[PDB]
């Protein structure tokens, strides 16, 4: 899965199933289920040595997975909203908060298996 040209080396995590979400509105919840198939399922990442965080690696995951959703999908046929993309700043936060936690055990642990 390619991108605007890289990222400067940036990893692709595997797919992922979207995560319930508890926003606390109804309208939240429905909107976000009415779209949860729209929203993407890998999450692009860089490696844990010279960052490493749960915020850093997690905002900045955010901020690119959604950019290849506004540019690398969006001029192919998607137009995701503002309340898709703000949907999004949370699907991706989940999914690479795990992303980020695999990353973190399998070096750590030495299980480098995705």
């Known amino acids: 899965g390619s991108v605007v040209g890289g990222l400067g080396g940036y990893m692709l995590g595997s797919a992922m199933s979207r995560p319930m979400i508890h926003?606390?509105?109804d309208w939240e919840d429905r909107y976000y289920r009415e779209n949860?198939?729209?929203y993407p399922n890998q999450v692009y990442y860089r490696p844990v040595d010279q960052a490493s965080?749960?915020?850093n690696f997690v905002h900045d995951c955010v901020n690119i997975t959604i950019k290849q959703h506004t540019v690398t999908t969006t001029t192919k046929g998607e137009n995701f909203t503002e309340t898709d993309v703000k949907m999004m700043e949370r699907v991706v936060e989940q999914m690479c908060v795990t992303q980020y936690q695999k990353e973190s055990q399998a070096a750590a642990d030495g299980?480098?298996?995705?």
């Open 23 to 25: 926003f606390g509105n």
């Open 36 to 38: 949860m198939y729209r």
């Open 53 to 55: 965080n749960q915020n």
């Open 111 to 114: 299980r480098r298996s995705s």
